[PDB]
Amino acid sequence: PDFLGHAENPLREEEWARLNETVIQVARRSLVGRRILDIYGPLGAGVQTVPYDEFQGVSPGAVDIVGEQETAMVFTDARKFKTIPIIYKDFLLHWRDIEAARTHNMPLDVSAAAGAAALCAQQEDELIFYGDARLGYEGLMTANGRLTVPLGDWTSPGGGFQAIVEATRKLNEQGHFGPYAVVLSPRLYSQLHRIYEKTGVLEIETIRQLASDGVYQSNRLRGESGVVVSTGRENMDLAVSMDMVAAYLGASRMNHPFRVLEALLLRIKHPDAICTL
Template identity: 45%
Template sequence: MSLDYRTIVPDYLQRGLAPLGPDEWAAIDQTVVRTAQSVLVGRRFISLVGPFGPGVEALPNDVLSGSGGGMLDLLGHQEGETLAIGRRSFLPLPLLYKDFWVHWRDLEASRQLGVPLDVGKAAAAAAATAQAEDRLIFDGEPALNLPGLRTAEGRQTLPMSNWGTMGSAFADVVEGVRVLTQASFTGPYALAVSPRLYADLNRIFDASGVLELEQVEKLARRGVYPTAVLPEPTALLVDSGAQNMDLAVGLDLSTAYVESSNLNHLFRVVESLVLRMRRPGAVCTFEAPARPAARGRT
């Protein structure tokens, strides 16, 4: 996500057709990147690979089998369990995007008055695209058979206690660390939570003088990340090392020119990527108990 407007931009973005100068493109590009970086959560703890190019529509995803430990032998003759590809599939790289308009009068006013171009709409489009990326990472896309962190088959699951009670969140995370470690996923771990659960963590922990969040961060050393794309109440603990998963990028976040209509100019913030999970067991989701069905009136 480091598009440099000073370099030659590929033709497929059609930027040469846009009525923008280098400084105006620079303002849009910098705003898009900075806004997305402030919104994105999944990229903060999942390794990125690529970009492979915008024309790449699918990539292999290998689910690994073989969990035995490394071997120790003086001559290397002792045989052990081999790490192998248990299942290979090809995952599509969907496009994630949001369009925005630059109105011709705004553009002319910026130039005539010598004031910077208003890039607020570009920022809003970048934020929407970033949220779409995180939804793909956490929830997947059933229509494309793409799993997400909290929907993947083979993930670990634990019941969630009431995080509104002091110490319950810490106890749940301790149990999650135990389950993942027992399954040979040794961290460091990241914890992603819905906004209300994050608020619950920001209280003094058991008269210790420190926040419960600080205690949890000692277990989740990759960080604790709130995100609005997770419904309430949702929490998941992840060993996001490259041996377990990565985020494969085709086209990294870019701004393209689409067309002109009624003298106004349509732009698109766009990217393509997919979450590849080699070991779904590296994710532990905390499952809240189902709410009882509401009783009808008699």
């Protein structure tokens, strides 16, 4: 019979396979921060730690052949890797329904799961774009090397043109150049969605051709802020230990509790690539 219990896997192999498929689908649609930076390789949950620092840093020298003289480069400086967080949003499945699905119904419902993952992965991005004083992190607002531009995103028609252009100026001048990506607040994006501009075509065409890796909108970024980076690797890395998954709390009073587990840590290996408002 059922039985009751505590041996599951409350699902069976098929429904279990579904829940995983549903979660990563909805999570991936709600993740705006994995689309602006290409991911690191999976390290498994086996590693607790992701390497942390580079550059800062010195330019010169060559003569002919021997020495005269450098460097030894760097390392830079100290360690250790600040443990990749494990973030979770919890939800329960309620009593019998699952077992009603074992005979009566073919579709097993999702009380939360797609919603919780959507809530969790989003909050993950808030972790990415802001800083955390709580445990030892680099956000894209706290990394310094920001050389903060006198904002941009005016009302007057030039507006965001001058901004991103000014960004590229100092970014390039710091002695770091490459393909650029631009992240904006939705409110900024609409006010910057232009209207009109140069009389040839609109803002999307001019910015997307200027930054030229892409243009993206995040809801978790500060309303006033927006950030420009360089997508090139060995600059920033999005370090993922474990991806998004459905996990089991086990038997409880009576319930099946789940959590969604996501471990994402972003390291800034060259913090000359970051510019805020």
